[PDB]
Design a protein around this ligand. Structure first.
Ligand SMILES: Cc1ccc2c(c1)c(-c1ccccc1)c(-c1ccccc1)n2CCC(=O)O
Length: 134
């Protein structure tokens, strides 16, 4: 319990850096990059018992994952990858690893001041996505 208290709530995307390059590294095609890159998703995080749910709500796509920390699950990403995901807490940071087609990407989420900072890493490319409470 209480593991994710400071993450819970509704968050709105307020800044994005190097997301197109991240998406290129991931293998997202041109048209999806352009439309996905315009989106300003809300992120909705909730907890019930041991189950954490993370939703996106946007113009482009709505996504939803529910999971237990450390327990691998199937995920369909906003760009339509079918991945195997595992999410853990490492020193108060949610660490989300996605595996597909022999590739891997890691998304880290942390609270910093009044923001929720999301760092997406694919090989040598990092993108930073900053959210504030909605
Ligand atoms: C290609 C790609 C890769 C990673 C992506 C997305 C798209 C979208 C998304 C983009 C546009 C619309 C909807 C979802 C979201 C997302 C956003 C918020 C919540 C949960 C996941 N993530 C996680 C990183 C982020 O916070 O941006």
């Amino acid at each position: 319990s209480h593991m994710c208290d400071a993450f819970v709530g509704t968050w709105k995307l307020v800044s994005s850096e190097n997301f197109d390059d991240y998406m290129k590294e991931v293998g997202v095609g041109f048209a999806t990059r352009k439309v996905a890159g315009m989106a300003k998703p809300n992120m909705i995080i909730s907890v019930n018992g041991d189950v954490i749910t993370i939703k996106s709500e946007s113009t482009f796509k709505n996504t939803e994952i529910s999971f237990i920390l450390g327990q691998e699950f199937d995920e369909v990403t906003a760009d339509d990858r079918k991945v195997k995901s595992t999410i853990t807490l490492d020193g108060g940071v949610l660490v989300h690893v996605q595996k597909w087609d022999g590739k891997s990407t890691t998304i880290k989420r942390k609270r910093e001041d009044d923001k929720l900072v999301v760092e997406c890493v694919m090989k040598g490319v990092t993108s930073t996505r900053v959210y504030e409470r909605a």
